[PDB]
Amino acid sequence: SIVFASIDPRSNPLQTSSQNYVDIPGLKLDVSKYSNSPCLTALITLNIPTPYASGNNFPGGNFAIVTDQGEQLAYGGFTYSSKIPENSGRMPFTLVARYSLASNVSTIKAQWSNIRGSTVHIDSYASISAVIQCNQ
Amino acid sequence: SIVFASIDPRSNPLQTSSQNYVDIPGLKLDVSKYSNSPCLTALITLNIPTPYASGNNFPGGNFAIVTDQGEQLAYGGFTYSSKIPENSGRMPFTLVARYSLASNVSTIKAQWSNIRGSTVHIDSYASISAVIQCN
Amino acid sequence: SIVFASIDPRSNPLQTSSQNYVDIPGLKLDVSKYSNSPCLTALITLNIPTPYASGNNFPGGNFAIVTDQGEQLAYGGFTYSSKIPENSGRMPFTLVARYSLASNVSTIKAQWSNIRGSTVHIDSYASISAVIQCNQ
Amino acid sequence: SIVFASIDPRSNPLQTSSQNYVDIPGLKLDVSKYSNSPCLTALITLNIPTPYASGNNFPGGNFAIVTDQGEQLAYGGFTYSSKIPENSGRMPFTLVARYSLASNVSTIKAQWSNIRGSTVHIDSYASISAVIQCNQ
Amino acid sequence: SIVFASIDPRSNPLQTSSQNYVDIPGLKLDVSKYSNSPCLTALITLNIPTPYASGNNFPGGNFAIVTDQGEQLAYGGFTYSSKIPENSGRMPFTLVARYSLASNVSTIKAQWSNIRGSTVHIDSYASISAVIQCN
Amino acid sequence: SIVFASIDPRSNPLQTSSQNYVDIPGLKLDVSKYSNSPCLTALITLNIPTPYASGNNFPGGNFAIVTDQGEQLAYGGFTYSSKIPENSGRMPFTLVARYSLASNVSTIKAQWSNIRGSTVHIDSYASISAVIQCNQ
Ligand SMILES: CC(=O)N[C@@H]1[C@@H](O[C@@H]2O[C@@H](C)[C@@H](O)[C@@H](O)[C@@H]2O)[C@H](O[C@@H]2O[C@H](CO)[C@H](O)[C@H](O)[C@H]2O[C@@H]2O[C@@H](C)[C@@H](O)[C@@H](O)[C@@H]2O)[C@@H](CO)O[C@@H]1O
Ligand SMILES: CC(=O)N[C@@H]1[C@@H](O[C@@H]2O[C@@H](C)[C@@H](O)[C@@H](O)[C@@H]2O)[C@H](O[C@@H]2O[C@H](CO)[C@H](O)[C@H](O)[C@H]2O[C@@H]2O[C@@H](C)[C@@H](O)[C@@H](O)[C@@H]2O)[C@@H](CO)O[C@@H]1O
Ligand SMILES: CC(=O)N[C@@H]1[C@@H](O[C@@H]2O[C@@H](C)[C@@H](O)[C@@H](O)[C@@H]2O)[C@H](O[C@@H]2O[C@H](CO)[C@H](O)[C@H](O)[C@H]2O[C@@H]2O[C@@H](C)[C@@H](O)[C@@H](O)[C@@H]2O)[C@@H](CO)O[C@@H]1O
Ligand SMILES: CC(=O)N[C@@H]1[C@@H](O[C@@H]2O[C@@H](C)[C@@H](O)[C@@H](O)[C@@H]2O)[C@H](O[C@@H]2O[C@H](CO)[C@H](O)[C@H](O)[C@H]2O[C@@H]2O[C@@H](C)[C@@H](O)[C@@H](O)[C@@H]2O)[C@@H](CO)O[C@@H]1O
């Protein structure tokens, strides 16, 4: 089966200047119905196709996929190659994780954080999705 | 089940200077066999791993996943951080959408458009795919 | 079903300056259980969310998804827009391939190569995965 | 998926002389996890491999598969060919039903009743099962 | 997936005195949608839980599961142990077959025939069903 | 998935006068490929549509579904209602079992045995089958 969540914050863009990972609002998957299922795995894709980061010390952004149990399943990020980008451009980002649903997990969700004091921005479509399948 | 299409225009590169979204030829999924099925869902991924855009005003490219009846299911894109890039680099792009197959939709396809008068280019492997599952 | 492998070589980072494609250590899928299945397809995703490439002639890196018989299923890459990037930044990369399991192939793996004498680097999470399903 | 329940009441056999259908203890399936699924069907099999019915007017037994709302999905029965069987023998019985899970029903169960004042008996293994699958 | 048909001829009982296998009306599965699929298989169950047969020479009935092109996939039946049963009792019957769906077969159906000049009877619920799965 | 085995011993009928359960030749399912799979269940149907038993003390026959580990999953049987049947008739028999494939099982097979010194006979089509499914 498929679980999916998307956002499209054009009118009210999202930003973070947090050095610690914080949730991205709206990018949460409920896997409640599959908790404690030794027979199931989720393949989770976080898609942030058009982020940018503003700043003056090689800005960028980081993203993670995490469970409600606080387990960080995957992480990565983008950064620019100039110290002070002329105008911070859109750097597409995707992240893929796996999670065994054997444990008592109920949520898989997206998080983000800054780097080198940047501000990370999302102002357009983004999604988190999972394909949940039997291990056989 | 999986549905998949790919292109590899290495001997015949694709480009657009269109300000309006237009189809990327060959990146289309025929979902006719699954349509009119309210309990099926598709999770669609557009993968354009090596695009670039030329131009002189912070060039870039935008992409979308659309139905044959013109509903935009997802969109996004890349841009460079310099007004006139020294040599427009390859900026990998992936886009993920979801679509219920309840309607009489027959095709899900990829579209592209330019940014600030750029020309967007694909000259190598790219794909569109879907995983189609019961709810 | 899902097949999955990930690496997180933070303590012992990976790199290549190979002009020719070589395996990325650890990013291999074992599909031998499904070899020669006439009605199964795999959708394979190579996710390298945080690579970079150092060098001084428009550096970058190329990636491919390949079978153990040497068939290249997909390929692509990233490159910077300056000849000599001030400090080569993180350029997220994802690649999707399809593979019919109607084959005696037993392993699918990730490969990489350099561009214009660059060195490509992975020093954090990366994954390769497949969703395997019946064509009907 | 499979849902299953069996009984083996060798030490504490079951019987009924009820003219009206009553539940067979223990032969119930819990389908509440699938309640109100619009695209799922269950193929239900009631297997009573070793029943008999005692009595002196062409005895036998009837069985049904019923929802917790009282809907009879299937029914059938066995009877002997003599008015007064010399010693009522074991007459294997199987019954198959279909059930759409597009319903708020939470339990499917087996029922039994007598014939012509018989007593029906189960003193060994019996089962009720369902295979649950998506219609597509 | 599941395919299923049932009958309940309580107000219009069925019977046969045919020595040759003949169709039981209504116990047929349309497998057209799955045909020409070499990698699909059907597991078919015929369930006739309450049949009986009348007659005076050890009566009984035989059943088969057959394709529309006349291939017999399974067969079996019941009989009484007395030459002239006092009153022909209900003898539950179930039959299970397998069929590859590689061919252009469109129907799998139930058939019946008599034994030693009997008349076979169905006057209540009966079904035919299949579970259809990838190999 | 489906596993299936059938016999049709018209030319060379099968019989047993064993009071202990013995294998029915040819009614064996190989579940090797699913051993040690906590995520899988098998629903197993033994179908002996046309058996009979000869004898002079209420003859009949018993059948079981058993694993290679010697676990008896299900059992049942038929018997006649007269001490000495005029001519032992065909008494259709079906048996349904479930097995969790979490254990190291490789075969599920059919067995039979006599009762009260009878001889059990099969001279026509019979099958054993399983539907194997994810528990979710
Ligand atoms: C202060 C200012 O005018 N800056 C503009 C910048 O616009 C600002 O940021 C955008 C995202 C939006 O919130 C504006 O309201 C805001 O003023 C320009 O950004 C473009 O703005 C247009 C709308 O006018 C679109 O939103 C477009 O997508 C924006 O460009 C994208 O986002 C930028 C931050 C870069 O990543 C660029 O590559 C993208 O295409 C930019 C355009 O060059 O110019 C000034 O900096
Ligand atoms: C050679 C040097 O000192 N340059 C630093 C650089 O650190 C070097 O490279 C990183 C990858 C690591 O191996 C260091 O041991 C090494 O000194 C800085 O890179 C950052 O280093 C910090 C730790 O000090 C973190 O590891 C951080 O993630 C690194 O930045 C990332 O990787 C870089 C190569 C760039 O892609 C950057 O955009 C990333 O965020 C950089 C930081 O600007 O500064 C000097 O160049
Ligand atoms: C009342 C009596 O003594 N009659 C016996 C009968 O035993 C009775 O019924 C069985 C079911 C059990 O509850 C006994 O305690 C009770 O005495 C015999 O039945 C067999 O009994 C043996 C044990 O002694 C086994 O239990 C065996 O499975 C029984 O036969 C089966 O059940 C019968 C009711 C018939 O359906 C028969 O065909 C089965 O095989 C019978 C055996 O012929 O003999 C007296 O009638
Ligand atoms: C010794 C004798 O002639 N007995 C017959 C019996 O035939 C014997 O058993 C059958 C199964 C077969 O192996 C014969 O070669 C053997 O002689 C009759 O059984 C029927 O035989 C015909 C063939 O001539 C068919 O095989 C038919 O299906 C048999 O009847 C079935 O099996 C019986 C054992 C009973 O269960 C009956 O109800 C079945 O229909 C019988 C027929 O009444 O008559 C003599 O007993």
Side-chain angles (χ1 to χ4, degrees), chain A residues 1-27 29-32 34-136, chain B residues 1-27 29-32 34-135, chain C residues 1-27 29-32 34-136, chain D residues 1-27 29-32 34-136, chain E residues 1-27 29-32 34-135, chain F residues 1-27 29-32 34-136:
Chain A
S1 54
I2 294 155
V3 286
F4 179 95
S6 66
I7 62 170
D8 190 21
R10 296 178 64 83
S11 296
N12 292 289
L14 301 185
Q15 59 167 66
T16 182
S17 320
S18 177
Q19 70 201 148
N20 297 308
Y21 279 106
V22 297
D23 291 354
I24 308 181
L27 295 182
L29 302 176
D30 183 2
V31 299
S32 294
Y34 309 101
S35 307
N36 309 108
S37 300
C39 27
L40 304 183
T41 303
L43 187 67
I44 307 124
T45 304
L46 177 59
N47 180 236
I48 315 298
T50 324
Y52 65 104
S54 55
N56 57 14
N57 186 20
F58 301 97
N62 299 303
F63 301 97
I65 296 164
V66 315
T67 70
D68 69 289
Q69 298 307 309
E71 193 173 356
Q72 195 176 263
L73 306 182
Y75 71 96
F78 65 98
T79 68
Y80 304 98
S81 290
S82 294
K83 193 182 181 293
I84 311 187
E86 186 179 358
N87 191 46
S88 282
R90 304 306 179 115
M91 291 196 72
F93 178 83
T94 298
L95 186 64
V96 180
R98 185 255 288 117
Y99 199 56
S100 170
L101 297 160
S103 70
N104 187 39
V105 52
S106 79
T107 302
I108 298 165
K109 63 187 178 173
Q111 301 197 309
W112 58 347
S113 67
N114 80 348
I115 190 166
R116 288 178 294 268
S118 67
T119 303
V120 199
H121 302 266
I122 298 167
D123 67 359
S124 64
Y125 179 92
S127 67
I128 188 170
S129 59
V131 178
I132 298 164
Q133 301 274 265
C134 184
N135 306 315
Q136 328 291 335
Chain B
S1 63
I2 295 154
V3 62
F4 181 88
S6 67
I7 64 169
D8 189 19
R10 57 192 297 297
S11 72
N12 233 121
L14 305 184
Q15 68 183 75
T16 185
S17 310
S18 177
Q19 211 172 355
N20 305 334
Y21 287 104
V22 297
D23 294 351
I24 306 177
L27 297 178
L29 302 169
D30 177 5
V31 293
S32 288
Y34 302 105
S35 66
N36 308 293
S37 298
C39 306
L40 291 184
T41 296
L43 186 59
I44 308 131
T45 303
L46 176 62
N47 180 234
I48 322 285
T50 323
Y52 64 97
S54 58
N56 62 2
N57 190 11
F58 302 91
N62 286 310
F63 301 97
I65 297 163
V66 171
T67 72
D68 57 281
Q69 293 171 32
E71 182 185 350
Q72 192 182 263
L73 308 178
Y75 67 100
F78 67 95
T79 64
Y80 304 99
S81 291
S82 303
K83 190 182 192 298
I84 316 171
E86 179 179 2
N87 191 38
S88 286
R90 306 308 182 110
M91 287 187 76
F93 178 83
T94 300
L95 186 62
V96 181
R98 184 222 44 223
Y99 194 51
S100 161
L101 286 162
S103 76
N104 64 4
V105 61
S106 54
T107 307
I108 301 164
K109 70 196 165 164
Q111 295 192 322
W112 62 344
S113 66
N114 82 345
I115 299 180
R116 292 177 290 271
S118 76
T119 300
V120 197
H121 300 272
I122 296 165
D123 63 5
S124 66
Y125 180 86
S127 67
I128 191 176
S129 53
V131 175
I132 298 186
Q133 300 280 259
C134 166
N135 291 351
Chain C
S1 296
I2 293 154
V3 286
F4 182 86
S6 63
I7 61 172
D8 191 12
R10 305 171 64 65
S11 304
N12 309 281
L14 293 174
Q15 68 180 82
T16 194
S17 303
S18 182
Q19 292 169 329
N20 311 307
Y21 278 111
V22 298
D23 293 352
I24 308 179
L27 291 179
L29 301 171
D30 176 17
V31 298
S32 58
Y34 307 98
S35 298
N36 272 143
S37 299
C39 54
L40 296 178
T41 299
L43 190 58
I44 303 147
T45 299
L46 177 59
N47 180 230
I48 315 293
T50 325
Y52 66 101
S54 61
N56 51 34
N57 192 13
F58 305 95
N62 285 316
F63 302 97
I65 295 164
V66 322
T67 72
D68 69 84
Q69 294 181 11
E71 184 179 357
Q72 191 170 274
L73 306 183
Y75 68 96
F78 68 93
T79 66
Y80 302 97
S81 290
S82 300
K83 192 180 198 177
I84 306 172
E86 183 173 4
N87 190 53
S88 284
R90 306 309 181 110
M91 289 195 69
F93 177 82
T94 298
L95 184 61
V96 178
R98 186 244 316 251
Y99 185 65
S100 171
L101 288 138
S103 172
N104 62 305
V105 156
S106 68
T107 308
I108 300 180
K109 64 205 175 156
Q111 302 196 312
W112 59 350
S113 65
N114 77 345
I115 297 175
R116 288 177 296 267
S118 69
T119 304
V120 201
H121 300 262
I122 296 166
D123 64 0
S124 64
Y125 180 87
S127 69
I128 188 165
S129 56
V131 175
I132 297 172
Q133 304 197 196
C134 180
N135 294 341
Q136 298 187 247
Chain D
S1 296
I2 293 154
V3 286
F4 182 86
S6 63
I7 61 172
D8 191 12
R10 305 171 64 65
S11 304
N12 309 281
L14 293 174
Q15 68 180 82
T16 194
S17 303
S18 182
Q19 292 169 329
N20 311 307
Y21 278 111
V22 298
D23 293 352
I24 308 179
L27 291 179
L29 301 171
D30 176 17
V31 298
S32 58
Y34 307 98
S35 298
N36 272 143
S37 299
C39 54
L40 296 178
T41 299
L43 190 58
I44 303 147
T45 299
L46 177 59
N47 180 230
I48 315 293
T50 325
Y52 66 101
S54 61
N56 51 34
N57 192 13
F58 305 95
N62 285 316
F63 302 97
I65 295 164
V66 322
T67 72
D68 69 84
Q69 294 181 11
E71 184 179 357
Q72 191 170 274
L73 306 183
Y75 68 96
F78 68 93
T79 66
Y80 302 97
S81 290
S82 300
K83 192 180 198 177
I84 306 172
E86 183 173 4
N87 190 53
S88 284
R90 306 309 181 110
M91 289 195 69
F93 177 82
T94 298
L95 184 61
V96 178
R98 186 244 316 251
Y99 185 65
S100 171
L101 288 138
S103 172
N104 62 305
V105 156
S106 68
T107 308
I108 300 180
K109 64 205 175 156
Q111 302 196 312
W112 59 350
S113 65
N114 77 345
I115 297 175
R116 288 177 296 267
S118 69
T119 304
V120 201
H121 300 262
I122 296 166
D123 64 0
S124 64
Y125 180 87
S127 69
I128 188 165
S129 56
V131 175
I132 297 172
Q133 304 197 196
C134 180
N135 294 341
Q136 298 187 247
Chain E
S1 63
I2 295 154
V3 62
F4 181 88
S6 67
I7 64 169
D8 189 19
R10 57 192 297 297
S11 72
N12 233 121
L14 305 184
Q15 68 183 75
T16 185
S17 310
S18 177
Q19 211 172 355
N20 305 334
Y21 287 104
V22 297
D23 294 351
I24 306 177
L27 297 178
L29 302 169
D30 177 5
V31 293
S32 288
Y34 302 105
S35 66
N36 308 293
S37 298
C39 306
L40 291 184
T41 296
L43 186 59
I44 308 131
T45 303
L46 176 62
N47 180 234
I48 322 285
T50 323
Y52 64 97
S54 58
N56 62 2
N57 190 11
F58 302 91
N62 286 310
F63 301 97
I65 297 163
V66 171
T67 72
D68 57 281
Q69 293 171 32
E71 182 185 350
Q72 192 182 263
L73 308 178
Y75 67 100
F78 67 95
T79 64
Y80 304 99
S81 291
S82 303
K83 190 182 192 298
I84 316 171
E86 179 179 2
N87 191 38
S88 286
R90 306 308 182 110
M91 287 187 76
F93 178 83
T94 300
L95 186 62
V96 181
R98 184 222 44 223
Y99 194 51
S100 161
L101 286 162
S103 76
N104 64 4
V105 61
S106 54
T107 307
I108 301 164
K109 70 196 165 164
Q111 295 192 322
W112 62 344
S113 66
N114 82 345
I115 299 180
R116 292 177 290 271
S118 76
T119 300
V120 197
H121 300 272
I122 296 165
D123 63 5
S124 66
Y125 180 86
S127 67
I128 191 176
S129 53
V131 175
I132 298 186
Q133 300 280 259
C134 166
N135 291 351
Chain F
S1 54
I2 294 155
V3 286
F4 179 95
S6 66
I7 62 170
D8 190 21
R10 296 178 64 83
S11 296
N12 292 289
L14 301 185
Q15 59 167 66
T16 182
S17 320
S18 177
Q19 70 201 148
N20 297 308
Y21 279 106
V22 297
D23 291 354
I24 308 181
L27 295 182
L29 302 176
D30 183 2
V31 299
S32 294
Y34 309 101
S35 307
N36 309 108
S37 300
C39 27
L40 304 183
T41 303
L43 187 67
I44 307 124
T45 304
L46 177 59
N47 180 236
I48 315 298
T50 324
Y52 65 104
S54 55
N56 57 14
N57 186 20
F58 301 97
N62 299 303
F63 301 97
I65 296 164
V66 315
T67 70
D68 69 289
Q69 298 307 309
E71 193 173 356
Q72 195 176 263
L73 306 182
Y75 71 96
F78 65 98
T79 68
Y80 304 98
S81 290
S82 294
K83 193 182 181 293
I84 311 187
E86 186 179 358
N87 191 46
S88 282
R90 304 306 179 115
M91 291 196 72
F93 178 83
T94 298
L95 186 64
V96 180
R98 185 255 288 117
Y99 199 56
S100 170
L101 297 160
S103 70
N104 187 39
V105 52
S106 79
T107 302
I108 298 165
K109 63 187 178 173
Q111 301 197 309
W112 58 347
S113 67
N114 80 348
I115 190 166
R116 288 178 294 268
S118 67
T119 303
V120 199
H121 302 266
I122 298 167
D123 67 359
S124 64
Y125 179 92
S127 67
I128 188 170
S129 59
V131 178
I132 298 164
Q133 301 274 265
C134 184
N135 306 315
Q136 328 291 335

